UniProtKB/Swiss-Prot annotation, chain A:
It comes from Saccharomyces cerevisiae (strain ATCC 204508 / S288c). This is U3 small nucleolar RNA-associated protein 18. Involved in nucleolar processing of pre-18S ribosomal RNA and ribosome assembly. Belongs to the WD repeat UTP18 family. Interacts with snoRNA U3. Interacts with MPP10, UTP21 and UTP25. Component of the ribosomal small subunit (SSU) processome composed of at least 40 protein subunits and snoRNA U3. It is found in: Nucleus, Nucleolus. Present with 9570 molecules/cell in log phase SD medium.
Swiss-Prot record, chain F:
Residues 82-83, 101-102, 126-127, 146-149 are annotated as: S-adenosyl-L-methionine binding. Its main location: nucleus. This is rRNA 2'-O-methyltransferase fibrillarin. GO terms for biological process: box C/D sno(s)RNA 3'-end processing; maturation of SSU-rRNA; regulation of transcription by RNA polymerase I; rRNA 2'-O-methylation; rRNA methylation; rRNA processing; snoRNA guided rRNA 2'-O-methylation. Belongs to the methyltransferase superfamily. Fibrillarin family. GO terms for molecular function: histone H2AQ104 methyltransferase activity; O-methyltransferase activity; RNA binding; rRNA methyltransferase activity. There is a cross-link at residue 53 (Glycyl lysine isopeptide (Lys-Gly) (interchain with G-Cter in ubiquitin)). One of its GO terms (cellular component) is nucleolus. It comes from the Eukaryota.
Swiss-Prot record, chain H:
Disulfide bonds: none annotated. This is 13 kDa ribonucleoprotein-associated protein. It comes from the Eukaryota. Binds to the C'/D and B/C motifs in U3 snoRNA. Component of the U4/U6-U5 tri-snRNP complex composed of the U4, U6 and U5 snRNAs and at least PRP3, PRP4, PRP6, PRP8, PRP18, PRP31, PRP38, SNU13, SNU23, SNU66, SNU114, SPP381, SMB1, SMD1, SMD2, SMD3, SMX2, SMX3, LSM2, LSM3, LSM4, LSM5, LSM6, LSM7, LSM8, BRR2 and DIB1. Binds to the 5'-stem-loop of U4 snRNA. Component of the ribosomal small subunit (SSU) processome composed of at least 40 protein subunits and snoRNA U3.
Curated annotation (Swiss-Prot), chain I:
This is NET1-associated nuclear protein 1. Disulfide bonds: none annotated. Involved in nucleolar processing of pre-18S ribosomal RNA. Required for optimal pre-ribosomal RNA transcription by RNA polymerase I together with a subset of U3 proteins required for transcription (t-UTPs). Signal peptide: none annotated. Present with 6560 molecules/cell in log phase SD medium. WD repeats lie at residues 39-64. Interacts with snoRNA U3. Interacts with MPP10. Component of the ribosomal small subunit (SSU) processome composed of at least 40 protein subunits and snoRNA U3. In the absence of snoRNA3, forms a complex with other t-UTPs. This complex can associate with pre-18S ribosomal RNAs. It is found in: Nucleus, Nucleolus.
Amino acid sequence: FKVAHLQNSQTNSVHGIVLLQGNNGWINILHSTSGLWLMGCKIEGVITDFCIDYQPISRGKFRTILIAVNAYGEVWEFDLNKNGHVIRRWKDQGGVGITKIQVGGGTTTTCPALQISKI
Amino acid sequence: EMVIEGGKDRSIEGLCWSNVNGESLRLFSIGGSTVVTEWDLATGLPLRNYDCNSGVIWSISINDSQDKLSVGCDNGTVVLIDISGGPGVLEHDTILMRQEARVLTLAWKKDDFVIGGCSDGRIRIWSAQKNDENMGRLLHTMKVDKAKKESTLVWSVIYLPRTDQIASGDSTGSIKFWDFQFATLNQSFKAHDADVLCLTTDTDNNYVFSAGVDRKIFQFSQNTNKSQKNNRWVNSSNRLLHGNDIRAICAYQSKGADFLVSGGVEKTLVINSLTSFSNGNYRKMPTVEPYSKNVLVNKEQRLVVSWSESTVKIWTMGNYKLVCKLTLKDDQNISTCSLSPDGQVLVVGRPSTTKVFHLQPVGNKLKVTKLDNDLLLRTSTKLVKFIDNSKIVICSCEDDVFIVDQEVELLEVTS
Amino acid sequence: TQDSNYVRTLRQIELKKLEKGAKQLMFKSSGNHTIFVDSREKMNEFTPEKFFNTTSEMVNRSENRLTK
Amino acid sequence: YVLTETSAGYALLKASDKKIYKSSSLIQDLDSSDKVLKEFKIAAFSKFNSAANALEEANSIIEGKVSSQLEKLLEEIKKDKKSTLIVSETKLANAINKLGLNFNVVSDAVTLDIYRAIKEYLPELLPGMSDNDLSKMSLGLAHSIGRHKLKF
Amino acid sequence: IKTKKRKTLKNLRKDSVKRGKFRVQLLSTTQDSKTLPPKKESSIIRSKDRWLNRKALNKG
Amino acid sequence: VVIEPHRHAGVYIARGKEDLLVTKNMAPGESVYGEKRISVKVEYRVWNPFRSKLAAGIMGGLDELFIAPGKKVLYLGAASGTSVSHVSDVVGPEGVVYAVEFSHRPGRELISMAKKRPNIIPIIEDARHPQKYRMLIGMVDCVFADVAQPDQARIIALNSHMFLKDQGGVVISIKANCIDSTVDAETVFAREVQKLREERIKPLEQLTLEPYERDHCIVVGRYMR
Amino acid sequence: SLAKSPASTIQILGAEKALFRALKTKHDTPKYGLLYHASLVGQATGKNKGK
Amino acid sequence: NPKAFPLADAALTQQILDVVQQAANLRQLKKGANEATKTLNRGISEFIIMAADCEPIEILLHLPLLCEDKNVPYVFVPSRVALGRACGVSRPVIAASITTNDASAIKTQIYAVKDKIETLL
Amino acid sequence: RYVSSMAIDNMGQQLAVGFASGVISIVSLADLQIRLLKWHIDSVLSLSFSHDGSYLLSGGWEKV
């Protein structure tokens, strides 16, 4: 699992999501306080790892992107501040057994932002 | 209007229409075999048996603009058949890039792409766009959520043109909607309890109807403006109307007609409304409406003849007693039949030949003997109706009206 | 590695001797020969020397039958 | 009352029919020729017969492998213009020179039978040539077009 | 005659008998080949209906 | 050392130290592909039932092989001279073989052996468009098919309806995998002989050539009309 | 026929009798062959002309 | 590249490169075009994998010409970099031959992948 | 046709009508299209939405 932040995008209300990597291609995203299943994102292949990217939009609004990798090397990016819909699908140049993706240089799940304007 | 009968050990699994604007209707159909069969609607015979050049056909679909024909075969092939050569003439075009498992259902996106659900639980996407670099090779593969304790088969695949999705029903009962570009799932519903054999949609793709062996018809709706701007189907409704199964479903929607038609293992047809499915009413047709009869009686001897597929049977009133039957197996298909007044000679007749049998009541049984006439043995018969005890009138399947035991002048009709 | 080279070239010698020895032999054919005929009496009869023309010498081995 | 366009190289041949155009494009089952029926039905009307020149041979070869509106077909349209007569084309994909200007063309399902007849008996009566000469000019054209397409 | 009627029926109906190394097949008729589409492959039809009547869906 | 003749002249059996099948020469002096050459004053090229496909049908026994020394034959599938060399040997210098292929990678050696033999004329166009070589030759006496494409019956039906005279021969070699794998050779060969007698090809014989090729057949037929 | 041969064959291509005697008894094979007279191998000196 | 016949799609290329990785662990592949042609000459190759990614593809398309003589299956995958990763070396690999064995642990996987290859020939 | 419960969400887009027969029906208030939810085998006694409106709590005569 990985824990991340999500914005409601009709209120400016954030809440934590946990993201579980499942069997088929599935990522099950669910609320970190109530445990309610919010959405799910399925990639095509053997899901091996995933990471969370954030991008700011305006004052006090950001957008959460799930970045999930096949074993083969093809990467899906899901916008999940709306319904968990794909916005980009690209392919890793080379790479055949893919174990771990990570982002960095901004707020990851391991360098987390304490304040929403610091995302 | 008409009925086109097939004979012993013949079935029909898929059939598609083709009407290029300005030309006649054309009706192709697969059976459980290696050929496609195109029928001319006049005679009620096959006018073409095109043997597709790879394996046993499992599904058939027609291109949008209807110049090409996909047949999806048991050895994993998808074969394109060039249809636009005129009614009757069918050419082989291209075998698409092969695979292992049999492709059980087909659909086209447009003239461009062809989607196919296979028996390994996957959904392939090939490009049938001629004069591209990737023509014929399979562009994408998607895998549905497999059953835990048995193999999964994707049974039904349609393309939804208003959005850009593929709807797919498989043998777990789950119905999935896939974004075509990015080739990936948007949302999965766990709708039925067993397989989803057939699913269809309306014109503007505000509804998707679906049905299978658990005999309920589910309706998935996207009619709200928020549903259309969010691309979110909801599992709207669910009806239980059929008795055993639903193996075929289709929809028609026009200015004075909006109905979905469904039928299955129980032999009856069911009509529902498209935009008023859950609310409105429905009509379960009778299992047979005998526009072409299979039973007639003769008042002398109080007897009645009745023919099912390739056998006739005769019984008398008294109670009742089965006096004779003719399971003629030199025959393969039956059609209409008539007895002589006085009950002497029976004549059975199909669109390929006809045959006449003298009958003699020998008591609690009959004796039946063929009487040879090669004109009858060569002629095609639709109707035989017995002018006299000897004279009959014959309507041929190629619009001939003979009088035997010779030719009625018949004027022509404005086309 | 050099005794592996020795065994490999011995194997290649026997490989080439095998292929260009079997190229100059002739093997007896074993194929399901099938003949298509008319209505039923042509099938009921013996196929009467339609390509054997002797039922003793030139019938049952097919590498070269003959027509005298 | 009809012509038919038959080729053997750069040498094209607009051979006319010994019957009507409807009789040519309607029955076609009466030839069955040994030699005499094709010899009677045949009529060598026009023979735009070029030579072993590689330019003219490969030019008509490219126009035969593509649509057939070559200069020899324009010569046939010149040398058959009587009353916008009926023509029998070989390939249906030569529709441009089939119906371009004053020629009622027909090539469907019995034109192939009459082309079987006239192609069976091209050398016996149409030219003043012999069988080895026709095979030699055919193989010269064949080697020319082969080395043209297959580069060297 | 009760225990061999299907035997003499099939042995008079069927064709393509053996002749030593050979096998003399009958060619079929344009009559049947132009009046009807060919028969279904009972292997695949049995596969599809046996699937739809598998034991895992409790029919009744 | 003793050459006996076959049922078709131009085909012989060189008996002796190796009782093996053989044809004549129309190439004076030389082999083309390293096939063995037997002289008996007169030069002879060994045919191989494994290297070639028609030789396997001859070795399995083809009685009315319509390839015969007084004809001209159309070969739709050689790709190289390894069979049409022997067909030009058996048809002799009286006739002509039209070796028509599509893939121009071994068409180089096809044209290279057609340089040496005037019997062999090549066509480098695909055999589903015979109209593109309308203007080259017509009215052959026997077609041969060795195409491993799925539309074998349609390709040779088009070539025989355009270029085969009546009552002539059709020899078609059918690979089972190029049509339908996973189902046996008996059903796919029955399906193809029915598909070919849908056209005006009366089937005469099929044989399976089993010691030379896996799951192949050679079907001969006479072109009706 | 030269193009469908591996690069090791193109190395030893001239020296067949030395090669096959040094294989049929277990000795060391040559390293130059017909390619020894190339100008680059002329520029090299030592064991790196084998290289 | 147009002249790289049969090219694999994503699922087939994923299982091809999976069997390449386990053959590399079992020391059952010859990586490189010259070693692939040597196994083609000696007849000890199960199937050939090539890369449709080399900037002269004519340094490859000669081993097809002796694959079709020994009727050994051959296939193209789109990335020489990924083929080198699968073969388990640090360089890009242009071609790789999975060698023959009869006591091999991955014999069933090799046979399944080579049947999926010879379906598309 | 007797209705024993109703609920609205925080936007007024959808509305839950729980009937005494046991069914629930979410109407979409902008266009009055309904969706039926049938689980309660006796009367529906209580309905609520979540804050985002994507979950519906229901309770009835079964103690579930």
